[PDB]
Amino acid sequence: AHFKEYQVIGRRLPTESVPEPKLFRMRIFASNEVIAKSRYWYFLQKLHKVKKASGEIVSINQINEAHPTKVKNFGVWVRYDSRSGTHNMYKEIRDVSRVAAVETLYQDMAARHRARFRSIHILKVAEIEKTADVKRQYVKQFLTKDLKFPLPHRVQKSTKTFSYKRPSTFY
Amino acid sequence: MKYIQTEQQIEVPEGVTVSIKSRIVKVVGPRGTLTKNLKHIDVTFTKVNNQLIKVAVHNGGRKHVAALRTVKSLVDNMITGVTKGYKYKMRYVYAHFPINVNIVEKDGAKFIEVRNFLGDKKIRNVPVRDGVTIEFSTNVKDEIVLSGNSVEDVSQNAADLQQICRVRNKDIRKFLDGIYVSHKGFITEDL
Amino acid sequence: VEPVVVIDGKGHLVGRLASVVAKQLLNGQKIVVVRAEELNISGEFFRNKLKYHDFLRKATAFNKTRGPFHFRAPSRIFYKALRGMVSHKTARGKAALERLKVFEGIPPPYDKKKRVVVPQALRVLRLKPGRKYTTLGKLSTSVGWKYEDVVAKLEAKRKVSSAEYYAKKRAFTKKVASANATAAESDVAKQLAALGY
Amino acid sequence: AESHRLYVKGKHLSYQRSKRVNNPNVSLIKIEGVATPQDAQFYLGKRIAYVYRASKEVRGSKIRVMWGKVTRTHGNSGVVRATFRNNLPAKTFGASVRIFLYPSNI
Amino acid sequence: SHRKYEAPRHGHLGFLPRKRAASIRARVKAFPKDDRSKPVALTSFLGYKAGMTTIVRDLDRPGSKFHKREVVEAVTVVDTPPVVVVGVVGYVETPRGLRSLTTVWAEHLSDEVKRRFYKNWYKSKKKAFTKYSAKYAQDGAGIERELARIKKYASVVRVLVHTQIRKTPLAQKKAHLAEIQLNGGSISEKVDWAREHFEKTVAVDSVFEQNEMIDAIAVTKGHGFEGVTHRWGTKKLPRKTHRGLRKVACIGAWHPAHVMWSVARAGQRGYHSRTSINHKIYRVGKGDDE
Amino acid sequence: TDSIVKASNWRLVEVGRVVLIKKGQSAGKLAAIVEIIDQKKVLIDGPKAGVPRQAINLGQVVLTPLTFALPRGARTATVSKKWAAAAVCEKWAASSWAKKIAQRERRAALTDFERFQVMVLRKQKRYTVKKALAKA
RNA sequence: UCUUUGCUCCACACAAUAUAGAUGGAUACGAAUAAGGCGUCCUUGUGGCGUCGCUGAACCAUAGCAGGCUAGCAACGGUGCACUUGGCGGAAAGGCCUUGGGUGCUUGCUGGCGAAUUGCAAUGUCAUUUUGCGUGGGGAUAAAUCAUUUGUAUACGACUUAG
Ligand SMILES: [Mg+2]
Ligand SMILES: [Mg+2]
Ligand SMILES: [Mg+2]
Ligand SMILES: [Mg+2]
Ligand SMILES: [Mg+2]
Question: Given 3-state DSSP classes, what are the helix, strand and coil percentages for chain F, each rounded to the nearest 5?
Fold first, then answer.
């Protein structure tokens, strides 16, 4: 759905052999807390010997963007399973928030690679804080001085089905 | 990847005048006038300084952008052909049978007539396009010269005259007879 | 909204116009489509010519006189597109197709009348630029329509007369707009502008 | 004046139906000028009349009437559901019907 | 399974349906393309087939073995009394075809031609064109404006002519009437030619000349209901065929479970309208001449 | 004579471009393009009208001929200052586009008595105009 | 037209007949859409300048007993009905424009009289399609089929001929 970012912190269940375990943490892009906690265990099962029965969750917290109105350039590192095998990707996305970037990334991957949410892993999302570290021309194109461009061929949507004059595509 | 701006420049010499409404181009120069229709291309034109015209595509892909430099070349060739002109020299090639090339006027249409190609009794007729001028070159043996403003018309006339003289039912590696374009240039070379 | 609606088919996509028209007819609206020779189809000319040849190949084998009839004019190509969107084997469908007329060109009375368009069926609004399209008159005369020229001649005549009408109408509305502007700067005009007119 | 109309014009479109089964006890009405349910809400509870003519005069009139009422909105494009005392004949698909402005809540 | 041995279709499918012609006079379904430069002339003529006979002539065909040598050839004779021009009618183009707008007639129609508008002439007041003829006698009012209408319109013009059947030995007494297109120029000149030739006669010498190629359009000899053998040229089945040998044996496969239109079936033979092209004229002969 | 090329200028998407919002919670308010994010969306801010600073697709907005000076990334206070400096809203109200919007709103807000008054006044104006269209 | 006064067109008088469905107006350029409309100017063009669009949410019409009876003021306009002049229109033109006067209305403005009881709503009846019977005013005075006959035709019908 529309995504949100969640800080999820988890902990192997305490014992007498070892109380106070090491309190692992993850950032999860998800539409709600149930899916956030599901994915937390999905990944922590891949990294460590733990599962939802032998562990617990100490805190789940929503992370909002600190600057939701600055236009950021993000780099995203992705693992995705194709039909033949598994691959890695670096994609640059110019957007205003991490969640918007991740939405756009899932859509671009669904479109250009027929990869699904179950097939995609997010490794990290990182704000490129210096221009000229960008390396994708489709983002570098909008980083030009005093940029300006038109929108040719405007289409005005009609409330009616009959129009009594020929329309115009001026703008 | 949807380039948001791609431009190409068109330099305009001294005596030429370029008039571009919607996408109908008209070039007027010393050697005559030419006009073209580019309503199939979706580009925009912009006059800069009365000797420079920019051609732009906005939010275009690989093909839409590839057509921009094509437009640039087409208008450049109209200008080149109305200032200098275009001249295609063709040579006749034969081993045994002399090819007899003449010009005739059937109903005032100015056809080219090729006779005795490989002993053929067929008389092969190529129509001359309007805007093309034919000269059988003295100072060279068996050479014809097609000159005009429109490179399209000139080169298509040359291709017609070169393809009407194709050999059938033989090995063309041995039977090389024909009429072949030797040179493509201008009437005012190195002005 | 109007008793009968005259649609100028120029610039329209066949299937989209047909789906608009069929629904309008079934909802009770009388329609007359003119200038069906200038209807547009998406896809290149060869691509649509092959599609029509494929449909032309289809015929009742033991007797071709009772098979899918292949109507070659653009008006009937449109009608074919449209009664496939209408349930024409019912009395309701028959009544709806009786609420419809299709013409090549703009013949009499509908030439002295107002024509409208359907924006959600217009090519310039619906197709991306660069996407090729074919013209129905060209397709029709390619597949056997004989009257592509006479409609052109008659339409040139129609356009001459229509321009001579529009000149007069223009010149008259100028007198009108000048008289109205002079009648402005008035108590009545100001009291009307206060109320939005 | 020239206009004496105190009703909104409408068209009887169809019956409540699935792909393959209809319900004549509910009819669908298209109201002119309405293109969304938020604007079609003005017409709920209003009286509807299908006025038709016959050759026989019954009680002083060759004009007979079916009375119904608007019940609820149908869809997203301003079509409404209507219920008549006796259902509509189904030859009236595409026929004109009158939506009156009473009972008014203005 | 597949036909053991190949053979062609018996008959021509573009000459179907092999039915009786709608009339005894075949109609011209195409006239020569008009050049609006040459004088005004008829593109066709009406005559009656008399018979065939034998001709001798010296052949001029350089390359043949019979060059400058006598050959014997069969010719057919068509009695062509001069036709009589009574009327014209103008056709204008429409997106649904050529359409006639007006038909102007002559003032005086002869009996043999107004017999064409009756099925029982012996009992009639004969009452034909008796008001159209009074449409004349006021100078040109109801006629000249019709002709001017044809001038203002009518991209195509055709003259109505009839035969002088009484000049033939036929005992029919009823003239054949036909539309014949004019292929001069200047539709005004076409219709003026017609108006001048109203009530007047046109001879075959003004239309056809010697060594000219022409087409003959006629309804062909009738032979009634005929079997598939002579109607289509199919093979006779062998002698020991039960229930007839003068038949087609298989009239179709099991599927399509139908008799196909392309299968030879018994029916009408003859009385079809036929156009036969490229018949050279060997003589145009006059009757004011022994 | 010399070369002539019909320019065909049309409404560049640029910082400082004033856009009318077409659909949404604003739905008729003005804003200024403050930054460009992609070919299809821009960051806007319309503080004088109450439009919060937000990213928006260009189908939700209509561009106007108006344009004022802004550095890209400009914050809401800077936009509010430069907007009043450049006098945007009065330049908009002076346009026939805005006058037509206001005509529409007024005609909608009219009542029945006012609708009677305008037809009376229109008949008067018609009398005068059709008297005028008989002497010239 | 003397199958015993028939046929047709028009007028209005009454009956029947139905309605795929009026209930202010189907309000006329053409072409392009990576371009146009409108104004204006000039040296008349692929011209310059200005303006418009971002929908018809428009334009026009619209007040009066389902739209009454009257008086006046101001302008010489608007609109309807029947006549009348001259044109244009053939793609299915059967319509568009125009001249002259006559007549009626005029809500452009100011007034007077009337409405009630359909009883708190009941489409609350106003349209066009055809047909028929009547009156009164014009207009015109045939064919086909059977039977007979013909054979350019033909199973029979049909076709082609004649009387
Ligand atoms: Mg055919
Ligand atoms: Mg085989
Ligand atoms: Mg076999
Ligand atoms: Mg034979
Ligand atoms: Mg046997």
Answer: 40, 25, 35
